[PDB]
Design a binder for this molecule. Structure first.
Ligand SMILES: Nc1ncnc2c1ncn2[C@H]1C[C@H](O)[C@@H](COP(=O)(O)OP(=O)(O)O)O1
Ligand SMILES: Nc1ncnc2c1ncn2[C@H]1C[C@H](O)[C@@H](COP(=O)(O)O)O1
Lengths: 213, 221
């Protein structure tokens, strides 16, 4: 019987290593993996020069990409590991509003659009959050050395961190969430193996006292 | 200034006569959700089905799929979460025991599962499954206490088929979504059952922290 396919998303701060974990976890499980390559984001350079002007249009542009990716996932008829979830764009939007880089009117326009869109977007069975600090994220940004990210201050990554933690407390009411500390001491392969094992552990039927197996 | 996090959908599962609608109602009351269910009288095929399972089995599955579809459109239109007293997966559990018994052909079963798969994107998929665990013997006794005329001829073997198929279904579906399996034992009412179910749901939905490389960066509210 065509039981629904397994959809797994990774979340975490900039530079956390979401993409590496997605590839390794997708290997472990036998699933196709899906990325959004940063070079394809034609707004990103301008956004970092002027967040207030380019924030809202980039959010719409990124939502279009998430919509194409779901149609691709649905068409595949298989499970999937995604290196980013649809909820993370909303995280970025809320901090931009907080910082005065997005108007409250544009934010509401954006969330109405997201709400209208969601029915045709990917909703994960399982969310894996890579737990890293803002300082670790800043260091991973510096080591990667993307020119457009060279200007990001720590305060921006702290806002993002704070918003992610609020979001996780809410989203975990709806879907299983594994939050896994990764400071890059153990390997990405060990990380994926532990994520997989923790997923299997959490997916066991809860029996409440039976007669079963 | 909030965000439309996805809505929560809970389905109750269990054998004939297990008391799923009452558990659904009390759980929805405890959670502050609407509850949705299908009165048995609205199934205009059920009486013919029990007189002749082989003739009416397949058309009833299609008919019931239409009901699950309208019920999902209603839930989506509501813009709220929902507790439902039956999941869309259970009709297929019945279809498989009908094929095993020779009451539905392999070809008709394949037609049905193709239809379900084309349908599934416009149907309700639960975030959480609550399975009421009752034995075939307990189910037969609940059927007699309720005394639906169309159910009077149901033999124990039919309920044993159903019970076995449910256990297979629970093994697969629990790979995709959280499942709580709960026995009637010692609970005096659905309200008492519901309160334990709700407590277990909150416990199972806690974030799993894995201090893989080191201590978690901060506790989460
Ligand atoms: N909705 C959004 N709003 C603003 N910036 C976004 C955004 N979505 C992504 N970005 C930015 C943040 C980063 O500069 C880049 C994301 O790359 P990444 O998070 O570092 O992946 P990885 O962890 O695998 O290294 O794009
Ligand atoms: N898909 C399918 N095929 C055959 N018979 C079905 C199906 N769905 C429900 N039923 C029958 C089973 C019971 O007689 C009644 C539900 O009663 P309750 O006590 O609420 O479970 O309806």
């Amino acid at each position: 019987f065509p039981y629904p396919k397994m959809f797994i998303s990774i979340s975490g701060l900039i530079g956390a290593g979401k993409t590496t974990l997605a590839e390794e976890l997708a290997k472990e499980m036998g699933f196709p993996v899906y990325y959004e390559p940063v070079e394809d984001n034609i707004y990103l350079e301008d956004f970092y020069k002027d967040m207030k002007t380019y924030g809202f249009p980039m959010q719409v542009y990124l939502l279009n990409k998430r919509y194409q990716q779901h149609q691709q996932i649905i068409w595949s008829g298989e499970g999937a590991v995604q290196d980013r979830s649809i909820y993370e764009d909303a995280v970025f939007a809320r901090i931009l509003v907080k910082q005065g880089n997005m108007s409250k009117r544009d934010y509401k326009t954006y969330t109405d659009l997201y709400n209208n869109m969601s029915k045709y977007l990917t909703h994960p069975n399982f969310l894996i959050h890579l737990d890293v600090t803002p300082e670790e994220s800043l260091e991973r940004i510096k080591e990667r050395s993307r020119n457009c990210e060279a200007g990001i201050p720590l305060s921006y990554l702290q806002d993002l961190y704070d918003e992610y933690n609020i979001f996780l407390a809410e989203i975990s009411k709806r879907i299983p969430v594994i939050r896994i500390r990764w400071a890059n001491y153990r390997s990405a392969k060990e990380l994926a193996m532990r994520v997989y094992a923790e997923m299997k552990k959490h997916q066991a039927i809860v029996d409440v006292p039976m007669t079963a197996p």
